[PDB]
Amino acid sequence: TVKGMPCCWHCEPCTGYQYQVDRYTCKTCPYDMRPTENRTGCRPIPIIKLEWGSPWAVLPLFLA
């Protein structure tokens, strides 16, 4: 954060959906992009297709 004196700053953490793009202000990346922990941008959201189907997909398969 830009303080009164341009001398000592204060890096206040942004929200969970805000990426540290610049050093003075955060930005917002599009959907399916989770902000990374480090200053790298936004990583893609891991998407699956229910291959195993253990919790609530093996009983329908067995009945079928």
DSSP, residue by residue, the chain: ---SSTTS-------TT-B--SSS--B---SSEEEPSSTT-EEEPP----SS-TTTSHHHHHH-
CA dihedral sign of residues 6, 27, 13, 38: negative
Method: cryo-EM
Chain Cα centroid distance, residue 54 = 26
**What is the C-alpha separation between 25 and 20, in angstroms, rounded?**
7
Question: Which residue is associated with the tokens 């004196």?
Answer: 5
Q: Which amino acid is present at 12?
A: E
